[PDB]
From Swiss-Prot, chain A:
Glycans are attached at N156, N239, N291, N355. It comes from Homo sapiens. Forms heterodimers with GRM3 or GRM4. Interacts with TAMALIN. Interacts with HTR2A. This is Metabotropic glutamate receptor 2. Disulfide bonds join C28-C70, C308-C315, C353-C360. The chain holds residues 23 to 506 of 872 of the full protein.
Curated annotation (Swiss-Prot), chain B:
G-protein coupled receptor for glutamate. Ligand binding causes a conformation change that triggers signaling via guanine nucleotide-binding proteins (G proteins) and modulates the activity of down-stream effectors. Signaling inhibits adenylate cyclase activity. It is found in: Cell membrane. Residues 1-441 are extracellular. Glycans are attached at N58, N240, N381. Strongly expressed in the cerebellum. Expressed at low levels in hippocampus, hypothalamus and thalamus. No expression detected in liver. It comes from the Eukaryota. This is Metabotropic glutamate receptor 4.
């Protein structure tokens, strides 16, 4: 359909979930304002800096072939054939969804096409037997269930209920969480699984099942962004009080809680620790639907955000520099993925063609055997746009993963401030969050909400 | 390695003549029952459609059968040959493996090649939205889950434990069984056992420890592959638990010598479920007739000759299959005979409509379209070689009709019931696996 066609000596692939899944409706419709265009423009912003960096691939002019997956594994694989028409895709940077990334990885493995995923926490891509050409910067779902299991132990939450999202992300998270919960003496109640495409009436069924064990006031949530909002919407209707322990799917984005914002007051969400990019903030803010002709989806993005139309002579007045800008918490991973092979290509260029800073006729046929195997090795380099007084470094382990750095978020309802996400701790191989910042954990608030199956009995 | 036959149109096929290999090796020990016994069945079926003139007259059918060593990863690399030109086969026969067939169904739909499987019973594979071109000739495992609940209820079983293997079959098998178990509310699951894809030697020993931990869970239900049932059964002998556990087997443990070979001590008193089948006489006088220097098309037939007969030196060519005392005409050999027949009948119907009067392959349908052929497959209605009616549905599944087999000693499987619509089990087995014995009035 619509794809980016940036040109250069060698082009670089991409796969972003621009649109939302339509289910029984059309394949995918409305765009994503935080995990879509914001991540889509992050790659272009990173590519522009590399193309103008004298110390990173001089005279190479990296291209872009960003496709569209829009949160559909079948749709992602259907258009993934464009990445393999030549076999010239030297690499693919995409797979924001675990289900999407798994399907693309299998196809690209046959043609030896290295792939980097900026957001894929499933604890199965680390298996090199099945995916030997896969690398990523985000940690797997291994040092993520322990963080949530320890939080439950920290609050002495023993009897809990788990909600799983059908696919290759929720099921993997539940299995990792289940074994950690058993090893930490955490009781497990009935577990309910939600399908990828289910009616809104079915979403009321699972919340009813969670209400059928009333000593389970704590619900552990393993769902994608499009599956957690429906449960929250199903919580206002048939009103119930359930505190939420959220996975990476919930995140700190202010769209899964918008609307049904009263049913997740005591919700704890764990995201991936990162820092905002000051340079990217100016790039995204200083954008217009007319000047920015590189992105075919920018015109559609200007319809949902800054509500207007391009037919009745509307728009052309709103500017992104006026309204506040909320940067996605995973923009750092997107710009790190682009720079991951940018230095690797420079390292490959320095060794394969040590004659001039151009193509030496030997790197024209790109092979995954020599590239990825030399790419999974030490590509240790300073993180781009790193803030001051920090020692962050981009590197890959033997499994092609990143370091296990996490953070803890809670949902606030402060007066004269509507609602706001506040960071209350991090996970540096151990819990460090404080108790005085959580509204329901404050000493001057009453007993904390707990979920024990049998009130303990004294001697 | 390929066994391609030259023909006007070629038919893809995936058969697991080998097994999963440990360590870095992607292939393991040669599988006699799965694979080779079904490999020549399609070849025999392909050699019978090309003989009679009532089906596809003056049209010879080729083949592009490949090797899948019971490995999901290895199955995708081989399947690239089917769509190498379209980056030409008209149809591809799906592999027995549930997880293997899934990875072939999500890539063949991109290039629009219909797929017909014979031994994959994944409830997931019934989703039309994700698997457009996948067709099945066997009932799904979701019907087996209801059947097992009916069987255990008739046996008054109350406390059972479930064992599942890693993949899309074991995980989707017990999950369907557990959900249907809660619907009736009569039986409950003691615990769930997960078998890793590549575990250690002592991992299987730990599996029986958890089963023995709940000593009152006398009956255990296993959803495992062909090579996993034997290993778990062997661990029971080394733990001195011969007769303590009664095994509840799925369609992966039908009438098969291999899971009960040299293990007829723990396998006793085990009841299993297999779909409708019959002993075809045509294939009885075909496998026993093929010998060395005759079936030179099958490369792996030489390996089959070495492994089966030697079971060493002096490999003389003076032995026959009939005297091996190991040929049993495996149950799922029938399901691949009519699988190609259903696809062949669809091609015959397509040939008549798109080529009126032209006996040969008319140029109007030379670039065969998978989408056009897909609707023909859904409307195939004929009788198989044994006599069973072959009919598909809107999702490409098959009607649920099974048989109940119980392993007896006299070492031969005997029919003890059926699951036509509700149940037909007739009383053997012994009443056990009942926790919370009556505590008197
Ligand atoms: C309960 O949690 C508190 C911290 O809030 C701490 O005393 C300990 O982790 C738990 N104590 C008991 C008795 O469970
Ligand atoms: C196939 O033909 C039979 C012939 O009696 C009849 O049941 C019907 O037309 C077809 N069956 C199904 C299940 O569609
Ligand atoms: N890592 C989560 C969410 C990724 C994202 O969209 O930010 C997943 O695999 O579903
Ligand atoms: N249908 C089961 C059993 C296949 C077999 O080995 O016959 C599966 O897909 O694993």
């Amino acid at each position: 359909k619509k794809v980016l066609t940036l040109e250069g000596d060698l082009v670089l692939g991409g796969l972003f979930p621009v649109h939302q899944k339509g289910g029984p409706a059309e394949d995918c419709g409305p765009v994503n304002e935080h995990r879509g265009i914001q991540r889509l423009e992050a790659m272009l912003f990173a590519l522009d800096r590399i193309n103008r960096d004298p110390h990173l691939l001089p005279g190479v002019r990296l291209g872009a072939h960003i496709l569209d997956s829009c949160s559909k594994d079948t749709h992602a694989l259907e258009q993934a054939l464009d990445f393999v028409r030549a076999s010239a895709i030297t690499g693919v940077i995409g797979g924001s969804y675990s289900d999407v990334s798994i399907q693309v990885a299998n196809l690209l493995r046959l043609f030896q096409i290295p792939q980097i995923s900026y957001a894929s926490t499933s604890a199965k891509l680390s298996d090199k037997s099945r995916y030997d050409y896969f690398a990523r910067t985000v940690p797997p779902d291994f040092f993520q269930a322990k963080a949530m299991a320890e939080i439950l132990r920290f609050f002495n939450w023993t009897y809990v209920s788990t909600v799983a999202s059908e696919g290759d992300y929720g099921e993997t998270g539940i299995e990792a969480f289940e074994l950690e919960a058993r090893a930490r003496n955490i009781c497990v109640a009935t577990s309910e699984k939600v399908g990828r495409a289910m009616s809104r009436a079915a979403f009321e069924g699972v919340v009813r099942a969670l209400l059928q064990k009333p000593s389970a006031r704590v619900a552990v949530l393993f769902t994608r962004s499009e599956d957690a909002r429906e449960l929250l919407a199903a919580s206002q209707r048939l009103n119930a009080s359930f505190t939420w322990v959220a996975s990476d799917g919930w995140g700190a984005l202010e769209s899964v809680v918008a609307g049904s914002e009263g049913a997740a007051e005591g919700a704890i969400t764990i995201e991936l620790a990162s820092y905002p990019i000051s340079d990217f903030a100016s790039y995204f803010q200083s954008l217009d639907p007319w000047n920015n002709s590189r992105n075919p989806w920018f015109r559609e993005f200007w319809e949902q955000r800054f509500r207007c139309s391009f037919r009745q002579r509307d728009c052309a007045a709103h500017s992104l520099r006026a309204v506040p800008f909320e940067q996605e918490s995973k923009i750092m991973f997107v710009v790190n993925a682009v720079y991951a092979m940018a230095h690797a290509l420079h390292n490959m260029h320095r060794a394969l063609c040590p004659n001039t800073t151009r193509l030496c006729d030997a790197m024209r046929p790109v092979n995954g055997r020599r590239l990825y195997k030399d790419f999974v090795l030490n590509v240790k380099f300073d993180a781009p746009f790193r803030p001051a007084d920090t020692h962050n470094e981009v590197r890959f382990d033997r499994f092609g993963d990143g370091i296990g750095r996490y953070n803890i978020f809670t949902y606030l309802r402060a007066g004269s401030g509507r609602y706001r996400y506040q960071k209350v701790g991090y996970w540096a191989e151990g819990l460090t969050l404080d108790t005085s910042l959580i509204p329901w954990a404050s000493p001057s608030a009453g007993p904390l909400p707990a979920s024990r199956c049998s009130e303990p009995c004294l001697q | 390695n390929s066994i391609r036959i030259d023909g006007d149109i070629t038919l893809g096929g995936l058969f697991p003549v080998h097994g999963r290999g440990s360590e870095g090796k992607p292939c393991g020990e040669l599988k006699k029952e799965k694979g080779i016994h079904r490999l020549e069945a399609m070849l025999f079926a392909l050699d019978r459609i090309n003989n009679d003139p009532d089906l596809l007259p003056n049209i010879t059918l080729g083949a592009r059968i490949l090797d899948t060593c019971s490995r999901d990863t290895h199955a995708l690399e081989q399947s690239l040959t089917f769509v190498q030109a379209l980056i030409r086969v008209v149809g591809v026969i799906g592999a027995s493996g549930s997880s293997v067939s899934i990875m072939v169904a999500n890539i063949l739909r991109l290039f629009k090649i219909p797929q017909i499987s014979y031994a994959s019973t994944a409830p997931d594979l019934s989703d039309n939205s994700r698997y457009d071109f996948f067709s099945r000739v066997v009932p799904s495992d979701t019907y087996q889950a209801q059947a097992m609940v009916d069987i255990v209820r008739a046996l008054k079983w109350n406390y059972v434990s479930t064992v599942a293997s890693e993949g899309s079959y074991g995980e989707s098998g017990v999950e369907a069984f557990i959900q249907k178990s809660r619907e009736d509310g009569g039986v409950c699951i003691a615990q769930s056992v997960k078998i890793p894809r590549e575990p250690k030697a002592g991992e299987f020993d730990k599996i029986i420890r958890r089963l023995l931990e709940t000593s009152n869970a006398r009956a255990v239900i296993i959803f495992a592959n062909e090579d996993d049932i034997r290993r778990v059964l062997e661990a029971a002998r080394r733990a001195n638990q011969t007769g303590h556990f009664f095994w509840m087997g799925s369609d992966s443990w039908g009438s098969k010598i291999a899971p009960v070979l040299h293990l007829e001590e723990v396998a006793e008193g085990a009841v299993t479920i297999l779909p409708k089948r019959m002993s075809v006489r045509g294939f009885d006088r075909y496998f026993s007739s093929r010998t060395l220097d005759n079936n030179r098309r099958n490369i792996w037939f030489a390996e089959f000759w070495e492994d089966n007969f030697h079971c060493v030196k002096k490999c003389t060519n003076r032995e026959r299959i009939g005297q091996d005392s190991a040929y049993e005409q495996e149950g799922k050999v029938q399901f691949v005979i009519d699988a190609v027949y259903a696809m062949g009948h669809a091609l015959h119907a397509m040939h008549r409509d798109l080529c009126p009067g032209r006996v040969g392959l008319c140029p109007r349908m030379d670039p065969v379209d998978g989408t056009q052929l897909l609707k023909y497959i859904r409307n195939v209605n004929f009788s198989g070689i044994a006599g069973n009616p072959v009919t598909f549905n809107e999702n490409g599944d098959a009607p649920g009709r099974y048989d109940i087999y119980q392993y007896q000693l006299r070492a031969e499987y005997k029919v003890i019931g059926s699951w036509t619509d509700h149940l037909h089990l007739r009383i053997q087995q012994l009443p056990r696996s009942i926790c919370s014995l009556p505590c008197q009035p």
